[PDB]
Design a protein around this ligand. Structure first.
Ligand SMILES: Nc1ncnc2c1ncn2[C@@H]1O[C@H](COP(=O)(O)OP(=O)(O)OP(=O)(O)O)[C@@H](O)[C@H]1O
Ligand SMILES: [Mg+2]
Lengths: 155, 368, 71, 48
């Protein structure tokens, strides 16, 4: 009458799909570990050049030789862009890593890490100059609301 | 009964959706593993076609080989000057690529120029007319120059004191003309590798020809345009050659801006390279009033503002000075904790910026 | 000063790159620049402009209450 | 040495800039330690 027309159906189809899902997840695990063993890193960091359709990329190596890749590799096309830093296979030159851009060692040396400590009170007589520098520099960093409410370009 | 049946049926639906997601993951893994089997091909420019099958390729920064096309590629389009991929086992030609973009050039095109319109530049009306007549109209309406038969002027040179609107002029032309824009800081062309800068200029002009209509705006030209350290002169030679290579048909125009046109090499001054010149002078009294009204426009001010008095005091200012005038007036209002701006703020600001101009030991400028 | 004395044009080019990395074509916001010099007469009329270095802050000889405060 | 990626502080993946030859993304040997290496540092690198 009711609930008896589906007993054999609900109790077997889901089990079969679950078995297939388990096996397919296992296959994914093997494919992923095959990728992992094929992801040992001597990478040849290289710059990206314009992409092509026939989605596929052109690479300029740190060794100043250019390659074309029939397929970009393990990175996605939407992520990459010209003048990017990618780690590629040391021999097959396929792209398998996307890197943070590095400017120069000197440029990073210019960055302040120690954060010096001289207080504004330690400066004498310069109060007008102190106020000018503060209002010019710190205020745009702090609020941006007092300037935008006026419509002015902050100095 | 329907609640248990719905539980199992919804679980089946969720499990099938999860299986679809897991299938997409498996296809990702299998497809990228299949991609892992692939091997990169060597890029290289091509040269003389010795026969219908033997060609001379030249790998980018590499040796010169004699190689053959694979089996099936066209042979006619394989002309001297076509980027092609090489199989890095036999070096045979395969997959002739269109041409290099040289991501330096990509950055030199896909750069934000701003929303600047012509109604934001003030006091330059005649100069805007000239620039739009030399760079916009020959591109927008080439059939005029076709029927008239006049060879359009190749490029314009913008020169003047620092802070009068040359860069602004270029910005406006870029932001308004729906085309492909090439903006260049000339010192960016300079590179320490041997002969790289000449290649950069050649590739820039080749990208210009490939992506018409385009405008090339190299700014601070004197950096690579000074009177005849070695590489800069060798690169100016290549710039001269690429400039003179302009056939009448390309929809390609060029702007160069500089603050010291005297230092510019007189080679550029010759007609046929940069014929039309424009002097962007310090704004006149009326021009200063226009510039001030444009910049101070969006400022939330109260009461009457005597722009004419400020113009009376603002003798010899540039446009940047008036922009400062507005900024300093706003800064004074902010210091006074006033949510608004009035005349005294402008008065104090113009006096302050005049005091600053005292520092700016502005040399007398003489044109080209 | 641009025209100096000239094999120093490399310094000129670097300075021009700085010049246009302060105000030219693409604007640069949220990056504040501080500069210090003792010979403002030497400097360009270009990098001493108003769009690049909006504020010119003079540091005078310390006045006598300034000297007392410094001590 | 350059740009210590340190994507997880577990697989640091330091970049190197071997002069006149190349630049590589590489990892430490079993001897040296993360606290030993810094950015720059003029490291030494195996040949293969
Ligand atoms: N006619 C004008 N109308 C509106 N604003 C102007 C005008 N002239 C100059 N300005 C302003 O002054 C500044 C000038 O900067 P810009 O870089 O365009 O000047 P430039 O003289 O072309 O530059 P450079 O010194 O690099 O050759 C900008 O902030 C701009 O808004
Ligand atoms: Mg400029």
């Amino acid at each position: 009458r009711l609930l008896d027309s589906e007993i054999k159906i609900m109790k077997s189809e889901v089990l079969r799909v679950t078995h297939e899902l388990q096996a397919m997840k296992d296959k994914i695990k093997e494919n992923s570990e095959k990728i992992k063993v094929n992801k040992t890193l001597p990478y040849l960091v290289s710059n990206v050049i314009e992409l092509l359709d026939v989605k596929c990329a052109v690479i300029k190596t740190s060794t100043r030789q250019t390659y074309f890749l029939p397929v970009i590799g393990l990175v996605d096309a939407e992520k990459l862009k010209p003048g990017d830093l990618v780690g590629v296979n040391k021999d097959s030159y396929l792209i398998l890593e996307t890197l943070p851009t590095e400017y120069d060692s000197r440029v990073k040396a210019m960055e302040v890490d120690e954060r010096p400590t001289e207080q504004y009170s330690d400066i004498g007589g310069l109060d007008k100059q102190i106020q000018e520098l503060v209002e010019a520099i710190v205020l745009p960093m702090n609020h941006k609301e007092k300037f935008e409410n006026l419509g002015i370009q902050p100095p | 009964k329907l609640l248990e049946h719905k539980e199992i049926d919804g679980r089946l639906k969720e499990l099938r959706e999860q299986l679809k997601e897991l299938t997409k993951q498996y296809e990702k893994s299998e497809n990228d593993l299949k991609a892992l089997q692939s091997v990169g091909q060597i890029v290289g420019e091509v040269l003389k076609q010795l026969t219908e099958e033997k060609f001379i390729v030249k790998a980018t920064n590499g040796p010169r080989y004699v190689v053959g096309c694979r089996r099936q590629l066209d042979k006619s389009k394989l002309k001297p000057g076509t980027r092609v991929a090489l199989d890095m086992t036999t070096l045979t030609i395969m997959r002739y690529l269109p041409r290099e973009v040289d991501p330096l050039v990509y950055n030199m095109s896909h750069e934000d120029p701003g929303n600047v319109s012509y109604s934001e530049i003030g006091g330059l009306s005649e100069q805007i007319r000239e620039l739009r007549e030399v760079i916009e109209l020959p591109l927008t309406n080439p059939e005029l120059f076709q029927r008239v038969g006049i060879i359009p002027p190749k490029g314009c040179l913008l020169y003047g004191p620092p802070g009068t609107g040359k860069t602004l002029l270029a910005r406006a032309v870029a932001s308004q003309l729906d085309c492909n824009f090439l903006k260049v800081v000339s010192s960016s062309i300079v590179d320490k590798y041997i002969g790289e800068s000449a290649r950069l200029i050649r590739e820039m002009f080749n990208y210009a020809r490939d992506h018409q209509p385009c405008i090339i705006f190299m700014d601070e030209i004197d950096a690579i345009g000074g009177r005849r350290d070695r590489e800069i002169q060798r690169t100016l030679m290549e710039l001269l050659n690429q400039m003179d290579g302009f056939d009448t048909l390309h929809r390609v125009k060029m702007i160069m801006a500089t603050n010291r046109p005297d230092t510019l090499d007189p080679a550029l001054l010759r007609p046929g390279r940069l014929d039309r010149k424009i002097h962007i002078d310090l704004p006149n009294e009326q021009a200063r009033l226009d510039i001030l009204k444009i910049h101070a426009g969006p400022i939330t001010k109260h009461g009457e503002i005597d722009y004419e008095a400020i113009v009376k005091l603002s003798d010899g200012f540039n446009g940047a000075d008036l922009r400062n005038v507005c900024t300093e007036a706003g800064m004074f209002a902010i210091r006074a904790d006033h949510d608004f701006v009035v005349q005294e703020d402008f008065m104090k600001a113009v006096r302050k910026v005049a005091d600053s101009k005292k520092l700016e030991s502005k040399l007398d400028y003489k044109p080209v | 000063k641009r025209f100096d004395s000239a094999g120093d044009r490399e310094v000129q080019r670097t300075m021009l790159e700085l010049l246009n990395q302060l105000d030219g074509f693409q604007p640069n916001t949220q990056v504040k620049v501080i500069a210090a010099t003792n010979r403002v007469d030497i400097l360009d009329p270009a990098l001493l402009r108003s769009g690049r270095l909006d504020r010119k802050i003079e540091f005078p000889m310390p006045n006598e209450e300034a000297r007392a405060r410094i001590m | 040495c350059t740009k210590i990626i340190n994507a997880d502080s577990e697989d640091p993946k330091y970049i190197i800039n071997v002069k006149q030859f190349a630049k590589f993304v590489v990892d430490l040997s079993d001897q040296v330690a993360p606290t030993d290496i810094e950015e720059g540092m003029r490291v030494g690198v195996d040949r293969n």
